[PDB]
């Protein structure tokens, strides 16, 4: 069954493969017909010499053209396969990337596909060429003697019987080989991505030992691979030898019986010696086909998997209010589906108003922020944006209308300009980028760099301090002019001077009338001017109201504030 | 140039000698066995042609099958041995490359990308693996049969064999140009593949941000645009290879024609007989094919090793680090001194960061370092941990330079909590006891209670045996920071560095952790922006624009 899945990828190029097959057949026939046109070479002078000269040149040119076409098509096939595998990977739900680590996914996408494509490219061409040669020899053999051709063709399935038995074992070995390679790659990636910490704790030897363990497992599998190779070679050669010997012996009985002359037998044997080599090559190809089937299991599982997240909608309204309503929302992470992180949240975000969400560590604030960004779906209740459920909006439009500053934000390895303008389809002008950088306070140090906004940044943002990374993330969120703005500890690493910028943005900027703001922080003095304060503990809202009301109640909020 | 790399590969393959010797022995047996099958094939086909005599027929056939059986066994053993040798060489290369990469200085990891390094570890070591077990085997098998075919030819017509050395079936000039271009295109292909892999690394590593900005399609387009260049390079290589093979085919045809003309001339003058001419032509066809095969194999073998030079460059790079230290005293007071320290990062040496700092830390006191963003506090913390070397001045630990202490000893006495800490995949226990060869569970529990981490560890699925996920992504920020604090407290350090270790902690928990030096035996450096926590300090250092203010 999986062989048809493998061969299905060639359905987009059938015309070019048909042309290649035609060229191969034509070259084989052009090379095959020479003896009939030039004799024994003992009958020889100029004409017979020039004839084979011309035929050899024509065959060489035809082979060149065929190889060019085939090698041109296979590169397109390989690139298309890799691109579609990556595209299918990126469509999966969020927890799929918690279950599968980065190194495993990278190894599956970049390494398995290359091996599959290379094996296909070599094996298909080899199979076609030797099949054509085998048929061209079979025709002459059938012309020589029908009876011996029949008694040869009758015994062919018995040779293929044995490889069909042990085919599954090659797949079951290759699966483990690829899995071990991916496991080693994950360790390598994780070790290299955090070198300062490993150096700080002097743990190079531990990482080396972790790598060595996976290498040992791979070493364990390779011995079985080699032994299987040797045994298969023995069996194939034995089958070929016996196939020659049986028919050769039968020919002796025929000639001794006086039924068939030796003249026919000599030619039939001389062509059997080559037909057997052809079928032996075709026998040798099959285990590599099973190996390739084994190598492609995980990428095809990626391709055929159905995402568990809902698909994107169609709504793209021109004007959006930004009103957000939570209605009895409950949530539990998929890997622990029996622990309710959130229980019955009910509140509303309204344009022009700032809502502060406070609570102890591990109470579920960032879970609410992730739910608001449609990264996860609630397991109970409803979450409505301007009266519509989140999935009904288009994927690109929704995340343009909702922007968030994540906790400990990430910065990609591009220029600062492209980092600020990340994710936008209509590329903004330099004036918009400069204004956005000025609002977040990043302009004061970006302009001091030797190349300004063209400065390159490493893949982890290592060339920036924590406050600078936070300012860049804030500008990246501000550039889109969102309707709902989410701040998740956006002031943890910002000094006292930069927090003034956030305060002006929240409570004094003239653009605040067009946004709904959800402020999550442990810096309690920042939320004193919030229109609503929600205290979240244990996944449930204990109390709410303005700062004065919560101070008067002398509840959890008052106890938290008064402690120092 | 490539000879040195080939010699290095030969030096590396020493642990595989007891298997390579058997591989070559089986190769010799198989090459001996293969030559004798056609003899008995001919001695059987003529028995079919002539009088039957069944006894002779059967006797010839039995020997035929016996020798075919022997050659088959030899070939199978040779193949198995060479495959195992290739696998061993590949694994050894990978292990050495990773162990060498782990030694490099921190500047090396900013000039390169992680995805590129991983794409050097994978799919690049295979080319270095294919050299000996694959290319040299076929090269030797071709050479040992070329010499035999020439030996057979010498008996027929020495004059014709001398004429056979006419320019050979190949031109040396074409081989040189093709070998020059092939290595270059292979190197370009490898670089393009690494650049393509980096895109997947970035896109999969930070997927939640991409989701939050809805930019998956942008990343897919970038990946496809990167794949296109690799496709073009592959086509450029393949077309040239095909053209070169066509040219060699034409050359072989021409040499064949000239040789047949000279053989016909020898026929016309009566110097040769037809059977000998036919045998000579058969041997000549074989030789003319095999010489071209040999030359092509040698060229490819050199080209792959030449193209794989980046891995050898990585394996040999000398770290930009001082000589390893040796000091490891039984007792350490913990006095730290900065003396006119000036520093600028190696990747940007024209912009100084520190401009002549000087201060002292003493046991039993808490010292606070404060300043605005970009003022160099984390740079001071990194310099104190010997992650970077100062460009001027000295850093002294108990009157010894910091770089003279043993690497494993130094990082057990000077421990720090980093800004935005990072955790590794695995259990909570393996993250708390990170970097320790042996640690008791009682110490782990005591360290967890010291950082107020038990009260949320007890709520996990398996307690301290629960997995935290990649980068600690299955934890809250405060929980991750508490685990980072416990990882430092479990070691009982003499000098403790807190690089804003309470940024994500809530108000209540921050109060219960200000007792950093209750026993009065540590040296504590506290880096903070909040003016609340600095009130407990005995010495306050204000850092602005890279200079200590008065």
């Amino acid at each position: 069954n999986p062989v048809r899945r493998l061969l299905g990828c060639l359905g987009s190029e059938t015309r070019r493969l048909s042309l290649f097959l035609v060229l191969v057949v034509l070259s084989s026939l052009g090379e095959m017909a020479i003896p009939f046109f030039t004799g024994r070479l003992t009958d020889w002078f100029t004409r017979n010499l020039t004839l084979m000269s011309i035929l050899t040149i024509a065959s060489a040119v035809l082979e060149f053209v065929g190889d060019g076409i085939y090698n041109n098509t296979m590169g397109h096939v390989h690139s298309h396969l890799q691109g579609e595998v990556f595209g299918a990977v990126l469509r999966q739900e969020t927890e799929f990337f918690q279950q599968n680590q980065t190194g495993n996914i990278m190894s599956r996408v970049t390494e398995d596909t290359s091996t599959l494509s290379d094996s296909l490219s070599e094996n298909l061409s080899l199979f076609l060429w030797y099949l054509v040669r085998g048929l061209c020899l079979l025709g002459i053999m059938l012309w020589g003697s029908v009876s011996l051709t029949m008694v040869t063709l009758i015994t062919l399935p018995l040779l293929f019987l044995l490889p069909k038995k042990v085919g599954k074992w090659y797949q079951l070995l290759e699966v483990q080989v690829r899995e071990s390679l991916a496991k080693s790659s994950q360790v390598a990636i994780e070790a290299l991505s955090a070198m300062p910490t490993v150096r700080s704790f002097a743990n190079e030897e531990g990482e080396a030992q972790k790598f060595r363990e996976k290498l040992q497992e791979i070493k364990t599998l390779n011995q079985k691979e080699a032994v299987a190779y040797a045994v298969n070679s023995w069996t194939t050669s034995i089958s070929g030898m016996l196939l020659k010997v049986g028919i050769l012996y039968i020919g002796g009985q025929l000639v001794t019986s006086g039924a068939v002359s030796s003249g026919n037998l000599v030619t039939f044997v001389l062509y059997q010696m080559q037909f057997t080599q052809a079928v032996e090559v075709l026998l040798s190809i099959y285990p590599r086909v099973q190996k390739a089937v084994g190598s492609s299991e995980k990428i095809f599982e990626y391709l055929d998997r159905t995402p568990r997240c809902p698909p994107s909608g169609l709504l793209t309204p021109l004007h959006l209010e930004g009103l957000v309503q939570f209605q009895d929302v409950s949530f539990a992470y998929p890997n622990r589906p029996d622990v309710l992180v959130l229980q019955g949240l009910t509140f509303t975000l309204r344009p022009g108003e700032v809502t502060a969400l406070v609570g102890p560590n591990g109470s579920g604030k960032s879970t609410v922020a992730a739910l608001l960004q449609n990264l996860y779906q609630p397991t109970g209740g409803q979450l409505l944006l301007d009266g519509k459920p989140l999935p009904q909006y288009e994927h690109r439009y929704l995340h343009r209308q909702v922007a968030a500053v994540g906790q400990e934000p990430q910065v990609f390895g591009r220029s600062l300009q492209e980092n600020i303008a990340y994710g936008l389809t209509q590329k903004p002008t330099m004036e918009e980028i400069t204004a956005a950088a000025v609002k977040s306070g990043a302009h004061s140090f970006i302009s001091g760099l030797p190349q300004g906004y063209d400065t390159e940044v490493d893949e982890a943002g290592s060339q920036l301090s924590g406050g600078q990374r936070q300012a860049v993330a804030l500008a990246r969120a501000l550039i889109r002019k969102p309707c709902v703005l989410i701040l998740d500890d956006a002031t943890s690493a910002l000094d006292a001077n930069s927090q003034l910028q956030v305060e002006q943005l929240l409570y004094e900027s003239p653009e605040r009338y067009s946004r709904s703001v959800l402020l999550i922080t442990q810096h309690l003095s920042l939320v004193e001017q919030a229109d609503h304060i929600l205290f979240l503990e244990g996944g449930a809202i204990r109390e709410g109201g303005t700062h004065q009301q919560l101070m008067e109640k002398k509840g959890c909020y008052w106890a938290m504030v008064q402690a120092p | 140039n490539n000879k040195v790399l080939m010699w290095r590969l030969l030096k590396l393959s020493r642990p595989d000698l007891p298997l390579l010797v058997a591989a070559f022995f089986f190769l010799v047996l198989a090459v001996l066995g293969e030559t004798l099958i056609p003899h008995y094939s001919g001695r059987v086909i003529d028995i079919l042609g002539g009088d039957f005599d069944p006894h002779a027929f059967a006797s010839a056939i039995f020997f035929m099958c016996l020798f075919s059986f022997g050659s088959s066994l030899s070939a199978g053993c040779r193949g198995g041995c060479f495959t195992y040798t290739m696998s061993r060489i590949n694994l050894r290369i990978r292990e050495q490359l990773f162990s060498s990469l782990l030694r490099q200085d921190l500047g090396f990891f900013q000039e390169t990308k992680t995805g590129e390094l991983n794409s050097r570890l994978s799919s690049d070591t295979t080319l270095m693996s294919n050299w000996l077990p694959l290319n040299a085997n076929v090269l030797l098998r071709s050479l040992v049969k070329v010499v035999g075919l020439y030996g057979f030819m010498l008996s027929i017509s020495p004059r014709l064999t001398l004429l056979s050395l006419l320019h050979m079936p190949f031109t040396i000039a074409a081989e040189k140009v093709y070998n020059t271009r092939h290595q270059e295109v292979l190197r370009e292909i490898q670089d393009a593949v690494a650049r393509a892999g980096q895109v997947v690394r970035e896109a999969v590593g930070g997927l939640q941000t991409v989701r939050s900005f809805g930019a998956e399609e942008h990343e897919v387009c970038r990946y496809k645009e990167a794949l296109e260049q690799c496709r073009q390079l592959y086509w450029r290589r393949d077309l040239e290879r095909a053209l070169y093979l066509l040219v060699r085919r034409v050359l072989h045809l021409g040499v064949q024609m000239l040789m047949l003309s000279c053989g016909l001339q020898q026929m016309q003058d009566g110097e040769l007989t037809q059977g000998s001419l036919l045998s000579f032509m058969i041997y000549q066809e074989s030789v003319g094919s095999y010489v071209q095969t040999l030359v092509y194999i040698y060229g490819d073998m050199l080209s792959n090793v030449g193209a794989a030079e980046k891995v050898f460059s990585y394996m040999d790079r000398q770290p930009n680090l001082p000589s390893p230290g040796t000091l490891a005293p039984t007792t350490l007071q913990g006095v730290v001194k900065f003396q006119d320290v000036s520093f600028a990062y190696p990747n940007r040496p024209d912009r100084p960061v520190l401009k002549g700092l000087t201060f002292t830390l003493r046991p039993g006191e808490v010292t606070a370092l404060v300043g605005p963003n970009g003022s160099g506090k984390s740079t001071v913390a990194a310099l104190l941990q010997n992650l970077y070397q100062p460009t001027g001045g000295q850093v002294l630990l108990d009157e010894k330079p910091i770089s003279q202490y043993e690497h494993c000893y130094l990082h057990s006495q000077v421990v720090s909590v980093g800004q935005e800490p990072v955790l590794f995949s695995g259990s909570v226990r393996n993250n708390i006891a990170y970097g320790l060869q042996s640690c008791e569970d009682d110490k782990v529990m005591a360290a967890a209670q010291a950082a107020h981490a038990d009260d949320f560890i007890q709520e996990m699925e398996h307690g301290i045996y629960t997995d935290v996920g990649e980068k600690g992504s299955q934890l809250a920020a405060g929980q991750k920071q508490r685990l980072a604090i416990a990882r430092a407290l479990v070691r009982d350090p003499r000098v403790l560095i807190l690089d804003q270790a309470t940024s994500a902690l809530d108000v209540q928990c921050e109060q219960a952790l200000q007792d950093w030096n209750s026993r009065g035996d540590r040296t504590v450096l506290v880096i903070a922006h909040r003016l609340q926590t600095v009130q407990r300090a005995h010495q306050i250092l204000v850092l602005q624009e890279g200079k200590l203010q008065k």
Binding site: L41, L126, T267, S284 | N137, I282, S286, I297
Partner: peptide, 29 residues
Amino acid sequence: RFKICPYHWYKQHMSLLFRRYYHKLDSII
């Protein structure tokens, strides 16, 4: 006619043999 030329026969044999050298060198190991 029907008859086989030994020279062309081995030419065919060598063509069948060397297909695996310039392409799929892995199979010859």
